């Protein structure tokens, strides 16, 4: 159970990283 839950956090976290990579490229870029 915990592993499944950490799994999810880590996959969202990747996704928030993705989008964040995109914004700060538009802004000042």
Instruction: Tell me which residues touch its own copies (CB under 8 A).
Output: 1-2, 5-6, 8-9, 12-13, 15-16, 19-20, 22-23, 25-27
Minimum CB separation from its own copies for residue 13, in Å? 6
Query: 14-24 burial by CB neighbour count: b if 16+ within 10 A, else e?
Result: eeeeeeeeeee
Minimum CB separation from its own copies for residue 12, in Å? 6
Minimum CB separation from its own copies for residue 1, in Å? 6
Distance CA 24, CA 16 (A): 12
């Amino acid at each position: 159970e915990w592993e499944a839950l950490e799994k999810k956090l880590a996959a969202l976290e990747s996704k928030l990283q993705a989008l964040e990579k995109k914004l700060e490229a538009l802004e000042h870029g």
